[PDB]
Design a binder for this molecule. Sequence first.
Ligand SMILES: N[C@@H](CO)C(=O)OC[C@H](NC(=O)c1cccc(O)c1O)C(=O)O
Ligand SMILES: [Cl-]
Ligand SMILES: [Cl-]
Ligand SMILES: [Cl-]
Length: 175
Amino acid sequence: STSDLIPAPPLSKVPLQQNFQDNQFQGKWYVVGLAGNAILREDKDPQKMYATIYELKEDKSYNVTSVLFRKKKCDYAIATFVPGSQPGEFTLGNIKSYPGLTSFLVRVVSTNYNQHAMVFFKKVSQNREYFKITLYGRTKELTSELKENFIRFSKSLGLPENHIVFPVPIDQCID
Ligand SMILES: N[C@@H](CO)C(=O)OC[C@H](NC(=O)c1cccc(O)c1O)C(=O)O
Ligand SMILES: [Cl-]
Ligand SMILES: [Cl-]
Ligand SMILES: [Cl-]
């Protein structure tokens, strides 16, 4: 809440997926890996897998729904991602609805659309700058190769290994 943070990387270290295809990116993605400056590995109580669903609207923004299993319930969080400056980037719709949130950016780093994606998120909340990379899969499992590529990438942004987690597959809520 008050603690020091690993700095957000310059955006020059975060690639953008070439010729992003919004229609192909839609649908359900499972969070198979998660890294960030507020993300901490927890052996005592491991992060559980959650899912994020991207529905492309006629106006070209996404209605985004995250589905999580928390405290024996299904928690649903909804947002609107508005197309940003370059295809594959997004800003947050209705940002004034979010107390303390002054900046929000999504950048799709890499994806093949049918199996995996890596996506960078940065926000400033109460003037503190957070960033996250998610490794998304169309299924709950990915290859060793994709997972190591993701660790390599997360580290290139200055995150140590204790800031890189692999949520445990579950069946509740996310299917
Ligand atoms: N301020 C806290 C409130 O949860 C926080 O951001 O930490 C939560 C953490 N998420 C993030 O740090 C985070 C970073 C950049 C953009 C986002 O949309 C995030 O959600 C997580 O996913 O467990
Ligand atoms: Cl819980
Ligand atoms: Cl493998
Ligand atoms: Cl390390």
